[PDB]
């Protein structure tokens, strides 16, 4: 039990991580100075989400 | 991708579609913890690391090669 438990633990940290990142990075969004490039819209890679299968 | 291989008026058996998913995903969730269906939606219409999504480019697609040259209105029945 404790071993998986560990695990859980450290995957929690770092998620926490991220998150505490993720959060100062979205609170500074510029809508106003916000640009998009319609002539890349195909050209960038789109994004994919994890497909693990056991 | 049915969608991007037809023409504009197919736009409603899209969306028939895409209700059907949507139901199939709210049946589903009542045992099972998926992904949101928005976000399942936009990671199918590359819609998440881009502006514009495939069903809009199709679209626009569609109107300028299809819709502008072959198309006549009629301005009673709108």
């Known amino acids: 039990l404790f071993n998986e438990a560990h695990s859980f633990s450290f995957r929690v940290n770092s998620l926490q991580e991220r998150v505490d990142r993720l959060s100062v990075s979205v609170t500074q969004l510029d809508p106003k100075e916000e640009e998009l ?3 890349d819209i195909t050209m960038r890679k789109a994004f994919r989400s994890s497909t693990i299968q056991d | 991708g049915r969608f991007e291989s037809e023409d504009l008026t197919s736009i409603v058996e899209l969306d028939g579609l895409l209700e ?3 139901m199939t995903h709210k ?3 009542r045992y099972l913890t998926l992904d949101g269906f928005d ?4 990671e199918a219409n590359h819609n998440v690391s881009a502006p514009y999504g495939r069903i809009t480019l199709h679209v626009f697609w569609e109107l300028n090669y299809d819709f ?4 006549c209105y009629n301005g009673s029945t709108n």
């Open chain 1, 37 to 39: 490039s319609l002539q």
């Open chain 2, 20 to 22: 059907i998913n949507r």
């Open chain 2, 27 to 29: 049946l589903l969730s």
């Open chain 2, 39 to 42: 976000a399942m939606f936009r």
């Open chain 2, 68 to 71: 502008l040259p072959n198309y």
